[PDB]
Design a protein around this ligand. Sequence first.
Ligand code: NCN
Ligand code: NCN
Ligand code: NCN
Ligand code: NCN
Lengths: 389, 389, 100, 389
Amino acid sequence: MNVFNTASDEDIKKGLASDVYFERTISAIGDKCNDLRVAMEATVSGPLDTWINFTGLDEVLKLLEGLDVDLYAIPEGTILFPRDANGLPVPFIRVEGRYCDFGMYETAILGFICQASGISTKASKVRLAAGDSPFFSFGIRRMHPAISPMIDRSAYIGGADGVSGILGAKLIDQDPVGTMPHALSIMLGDEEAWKLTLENTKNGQKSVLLIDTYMDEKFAAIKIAEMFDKVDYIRLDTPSSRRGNFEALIREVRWELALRGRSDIKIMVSGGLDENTVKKLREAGAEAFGVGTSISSAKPFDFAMDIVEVNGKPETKRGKMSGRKNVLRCTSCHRIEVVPANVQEKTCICGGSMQNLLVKYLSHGKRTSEYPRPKEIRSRSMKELEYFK
Amino acid sequence: MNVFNTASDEDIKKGLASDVYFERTISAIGDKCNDLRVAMEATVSGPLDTWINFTGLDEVLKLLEGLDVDLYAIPEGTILFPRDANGLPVPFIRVEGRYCDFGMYETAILGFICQASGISTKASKVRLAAGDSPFFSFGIRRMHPAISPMIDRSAYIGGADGVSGILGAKLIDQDPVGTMPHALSIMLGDEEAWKLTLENTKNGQKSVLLIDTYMDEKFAAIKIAEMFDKVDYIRLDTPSSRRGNFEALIREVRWELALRGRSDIKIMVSGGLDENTVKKLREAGAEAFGVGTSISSAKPFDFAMDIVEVNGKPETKRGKMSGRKNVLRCTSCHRIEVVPANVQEKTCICGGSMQNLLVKYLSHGKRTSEYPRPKEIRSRSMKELEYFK
Amino acid sequence: WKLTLENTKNGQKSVLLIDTYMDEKFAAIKIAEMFDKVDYIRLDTPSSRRGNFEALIREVRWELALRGRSDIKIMVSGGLDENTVKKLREAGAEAFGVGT
Amino acid sequence: MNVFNTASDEDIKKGLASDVYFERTISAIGDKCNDLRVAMEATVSGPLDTWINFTGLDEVLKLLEGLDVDLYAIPEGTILFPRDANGLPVPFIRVEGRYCDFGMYETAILGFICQASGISTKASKVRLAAGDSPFFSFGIRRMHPAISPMIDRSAYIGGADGVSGILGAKLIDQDPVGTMPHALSIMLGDEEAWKLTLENTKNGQKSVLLIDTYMDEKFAAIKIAEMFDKVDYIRLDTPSSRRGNFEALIREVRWELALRGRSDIKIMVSGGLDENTVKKLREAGAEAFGVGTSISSAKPFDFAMDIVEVNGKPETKRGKMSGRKNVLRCTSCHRIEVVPANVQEKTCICGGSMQNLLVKYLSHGKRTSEYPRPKEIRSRSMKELEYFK
Ligand SMILES: O=C(O)c1ccc[n+]([C@@H]2O[C@H](COP(=O)([O-])O)[C@@H](O)[C@H]2O)c1
Ligand SMILES: O=C(O)c1ccc[n+]([C@@H]2O[C@H](COP(=O)([O-])O)[C@@H](O)[C@H]2O)c1
Ligand SMILES: O=C(O)c1ccc[n+]([C@@H]2O[C@H](COP(=O)([O-])O)[C@@H](O)[C@H]2O)c1
Ligand SMILES: O=C(O)c1ccc[n+]([C@@H]2O[C@H](COP(=O)([O-])O)[C@@H](O)[C@H]2O)c1
């Protein structure tokens, strides 16, 4: 339909971004369509050995808005495990209405939550490792450009303090983050590149200088210390083959700077960073992190959507549990317990009462509240990430 | 800019889908821009323990067409390793021109080849395992819908005989593939669902019936054998928790059918399939495969783009090899050898002569040939996949 | 099933083997809404159908409670071990037939 | 019923050695009994990563003789894998008749083949490792005495040249094997014990002297060499805690004997022997082996018996393949292929023709041939063990 190999928002809204057997089956159903009301629930088949930071539901609402459907879901930014206290699959969203009215959208709805959720969950992990130190989403270049804005949104909501993509920055309503590339230094030499970068950085923003382009990080650090003065960060993006012991290198640089009484210069690292990498380099002395691929490429959660009830009667296939359900959670020990939809709360001297986490976002196609902006959502997940060490 | 969290083709064409430090650095360069001609080469830092089936270059050409740049690259569908006979990084594409003229596109260019390449490479692996048996791309639902068309294109070029997505089908100029979903059987019961599916399938296409919704695959298979007649395939999408030994189950079904002299009914499997899974189930008796997540979620190759020459002089950073280069390959023992761009061919009694694999696709922004359609490209990769067992 | 029930007397609990033809889940529903005095339901799931015996057992227990028949207890058997027993018990199995 | 916790032959013949639910179910069936003819086949669920040397069928015939049943089976001593060329379970015996007529015997029939088969299969393994060297079944003391005769029978049929048990010896029609115990040496001292043993050994039999009771095997070996003359074997049953390197010790002894030109004295080992142990000690110089626990305690094969057809119609449960079946094998490349009972032979240019391995041993309760004696059976398994390295 368009220039690149992508689906326009129109196309996806028309049911064009889907597996053909859906429209073909709806077509086969024909007249019976009018008489088939169902409730479908999305659950995680995917990785069960990890909690998840739910994200991407905003996209689902924009898609289903208008159809005569009811939509329940766990708010984005909520963190929990895929199975509850008793090993039951936790339903993340429930859709109700005439099957033929939205059935062709299964592909898109899953797509909206699988990939986004893996991203935000990976970012929350990095968030835990980075501690008080700032980290940024630097990985849109590893994924197809068309989805670069949602990648940065999920990395942000997941915990990133900032983002490098222009469009994602816009979406989360923050200024894009950026330092200087090796290119500048390869074209103009270090000195010229460093001077230019400093002359071009204004208040409100910190100075960052890339130093591993030509020299050894240690001598490049000395040269900068005794050449400039207003340099906030020094960034090391050490080539893989020079990374014998990145931690030892970072200690060496910090020592060499303090010796010259320039321990005011902070260190930022980037390049093939991970939560493990981040934790180690931080204990080594790195105070800022540029994290890309590990986050932008997070494996998606394997969400599945199934009809759990038909025309009021619980009905499913082998492997699924039938009936509409709610997701209750203790107001205290954040314990979960999936229950039949006719149960709204449950007591538990363990920690007060258990209240439903599901929330109605659409009623007959209409929104039931104003949707939170990214900042509000990541403010929620940071509070929720609290209960996870 | 648009409804969903995506970048429109306009946005990406405007340099909007990128890391801000690129435009910011180009901006800083200012007047010097006119005097900075560079050649940048994309190489695989990514997985080195595997060959790659290069895909996504078509998207790169549509992006760079118009800029006053020269573009060299390895044609899509070429299969090779990231390092050559002597462990040197193989350059997959080279761009030449004023740095400020395209420098902001680094993010998009990488995005176009990293993710697509992982997909097509994973599909070639499945292609090797499926043997003569047909397999289809069934995984767009795991990834964001906006990029569903490129996913199916790469799975196709990589070896898939067919694809389930509507838009991807259109792009590769083939009819979308589809069978029947559990939903149909959950709403109308098996019998009704099976009868409907058969009545709704026309010549040119084979009949496929999903059987694991309510019954045990074995008894559902008997019931179908002695109930219908014109049923080409039987599809098993056995729930994970019922998959004690999927291979043994498949043998059991095949035996039970032959006993009733209905070995004409073929078996198709789907659900969490892998190349290993595919190889085993095929040795077990499965004759068709629906492969999703393992392919749609393939890890991306970690491509990196660097300035390798400036205003005619070889120049790079630590970790990269400078100078423009060519990629020569033996016409026989498909051996590779990266060399300086002033070397077009090399002899080698090992197998004739070594000829350059790089091909000029853009000259001063103009195409230098008509771009191949998906069918032509996968016809190339199947020939190339020949030299790989 | 009818024969087994008619043939079981007081002092002893009723036990019905359910995995012979149907999927344990649907066989469990069918029994719940067909009988009433069935103490135990026994699953001797064939090895090749045992993808995740624990998950299957949870599925059955849920499907029964939904129909308010959580009074029906579950017994497992077939290639059981102390490890197997500990896991299936945490899964919801209340009786075990342990052989080999 | 008797002194010890055993089932008399009467008890087992009466259906007393069984799981109660069998008679209880037959009882429940009542009048329908007259109308329920079935065919049940025994298959190996058990270890599938190994071939099996089938044994114990003789016991099954003595149990079923008289009942109006037909019995097919693979002859004892046949060696093969549990699954055929295509991964299908191989049926080892088939019983046909009124279910109520023998159904209570399932427990006993399985018991007769599971444990015996593990024993004979383990012995064939030791047989392969022992090579040309003789080994004996020495393990009845680890198992309940009541079944000591069947243990030695299976170890013999499996490959043992001799057996230590009195009753088992009788059953295989051979003289029991025996050397001298530590007791004799603990009560009378070595010299007296050795002299007594020699004075008490007659022609036809070799002399064997236990030497590790008091001295170091090396010095005890010297002492014997220069004290006696007609000593055929020297037996080392070195205590576990003295077995630092049993192989090195054995080499040391052999050297010390040859030095004194007494390499005519052969060495026999015993104590915690295995096929691996046997292979190593044999390469070390041991020429005879006393093998116990590893054989007498062999894990049983997990045989299962199921109704595969009812009143002429193929019928089974999930997990089993229905219908009566035959087991065909190539007269050459000893390949197997289970097929429907209406197939007696199959061609295969691979190696002549495939002929049925199943053999009718009972017809209406009557034997259809004279049953082979143990010697004939192990003569068969040694020929069959040929095709296994
Ligand atoms: O400097 C920036 O603002 C910047 C923004 C986005 C990505 N990057 C670069 O891309 C690399 C990190 O991506 P990755 O996948 O190796 O983690 C690292 O070498 C950075 O120099 C750099
Ligand atoms: O039937 C189709 O045409 C079809 C097209 C695309 C995806 N699917 C389904 O999605 C599942 C396979 O995706 P996956 O990631 O588990 O490999 C499998 O259970 C199929 O039933 C099915
Ligand atoms: O139901 C009984 O009373 C019964 C008594 C003894 C043994 N069994 C069966 O034998 C199997 C268990 O033995 P095992 O070695 O697999 O643990 C299991 O499938 C049961 O159905 C069953
Ligand atoms: O000497 C015999 O005739 C003899 C007959 C049967 C068993 N044994 C002994 O029992 C031991 C071997 O049994 P095992 O289970 O350790 O292999 C070994 O120490 C022998 O001395 C010895």
